Design a protein around this ligand. Structure first.
Ligand SMILES: COc1cccc(COC(=O)c2cn[nH]c2)c1
Ligand SMILES: COc1cccc(COC(=O)c2cn[nH]c2)c1
Ligand SMILES: COc1cccc(COC(=O)c2cn[nH]c2)c1
Ligand SMILES: COc1cccc(COC(=O)c2cn[nH]c2)c1
Lengths: 211, 214
């Protein structure tokens, strides 16, 4: 059983993962994903969510007063507050495994430059807060990162070292290229060693950092 | 001006592109249902892996037909996969100058490798990872790549992590903005920010400064 709340100024962005849920998953109370428009918590007629950064420099910083109200209403002391940001700790498969057993995730989607730091600092005094990066690149908003995180976590919720080498399926011959004959050999010990070497070679070529 | 074609068995999931509204006509984003190139009755796109293993592998025949119609020799064929070369900010900059990206979204355990090998004989192919986690499909990863690239396209920050940012009010729930940021001293602000950045990078990403990861 897991509840995910997403707070964003683009709630429509999250509508695909809402419907991506199996009907037998949400009916069983194993998962409910709710999306909230951040502007619900704005204070002015202009529904402002950002303001200029202290200490200058082009870019806009999201307002702490608005975010604080939103989190005040949505978060509980049991909440795991996830803040996607390119300045975050790495979000990896180990993280997804860890978060897969959480009762309540709140994902705060920020917009470039970021969210006033006091929001996270304040929240962290009564809940667990995790600023995380899904990758070394910059997005205009956290929304796509939320999709990634939601998918990587939920697929580890039951019912909701090296790189892997190439995979093949039918036909055995296609556009002049044959499936590696070892895979059709019925020698499963040999297949395993073949696959291990394929993985070692691909990892060396693509991710030497992993060795 | 850039064309992005995305190929997927879940074209619905790509509605979030509608966002990075290309209303300015600086890019056209097209999404294609892979099942459109099938001939079967049940329109099968996958099958069990040769050599055994878990899950299913997407068939090469369907993908070959789809890529034939959609790609040219000038296309950059992008295949999100956790087994790919890393997609980073540097990659985003590089791809921001491309005429034509085609993004092949895989599902299940993967796409028959011969799809990529075949395509590489007529176009440039890039198998890429957007990060070290596993997804059910390439769709979300395509969204990430599109966002990272499109915001760099002409007409629309790497080595360190950026430090914290603040805005009004100068005090909030008893928490004050760092006084230096209120001081109007550009040099001291630059110095403090540079320091916060380095301090955050060593704490969260020691690898970026050439130290052992925790
Ligand atoms: C909340 O503060 C910010 C600031 C800047 C951009 C974003 C959007 O997230 C990303 O771009 C990202 C997440 N992981 N890798 C990249 C959020
Ligand atoms: C070590 O860093 C990580 C973390 C998570 C996944 C991976 C690679 O997984 C694959 O190569 C794969 C999975 N399905 N098909 C290919 C690497
Ligand atoms: C090639 O077909 C496959 C196979 C396995 C998973 C996926 C989805 O992509 C990812 O999970 C991914 C991309 N970068 N980091 C994770 C596609
Ligand atoms: C080294 O790899 C990368 C790549 C891209 C960005 C970053 C860090 O960016 C930020 O911290 C940020 C940018 N806007 N707001 C916060 C690191």
């Amino acid at each position: 059983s897991m509840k995910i709340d997403v707070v964003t100024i683009f709630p429509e962005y999250l509508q695909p993962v809402r419907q991506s849920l199996p009907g037998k998953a949400i009916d069983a109370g194993l998962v409910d994903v709710a999306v909230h428009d951040l502007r619900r918590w704005t204070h002015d007629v202009h529904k402002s969510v950002d303001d200029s950064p202290y200490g200058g420099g082009p870019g806009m910083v999201m307002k702490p007063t608005v975010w604080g109200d939103a989190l005040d209403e949505i978060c509980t002391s049991e909440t795991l507050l996830v803040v996607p940001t390119p300045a975050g700790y790495p979000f990896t498969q180990e993280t997804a495994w860890q978060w897969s057993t959480e009762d309540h995730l709140v994902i705060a989607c920020g917009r470039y430059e970021g969210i006033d730091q006091r929001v996270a600092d304040d929240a962290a005094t009564r809940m667990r807060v995790r600023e995380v990066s899904i990758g070394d690149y910059v997005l205009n908003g956290g929304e796509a990162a939320a999709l990634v995180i939601i998918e990587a976590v939920l697929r580890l919720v039951p019912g909701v070292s090296l790189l892997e080498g190439p995979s093949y399926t039918r036909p055995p011959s296609w556009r002049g290229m044959d499936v590696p004959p070892v895979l059709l050999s019925g020698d499963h010990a040999k297949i395993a060693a073949w696959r291990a070497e394929q993985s070692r070679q691909r990892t060396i070529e693509r991710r030497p950092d992993l060795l």
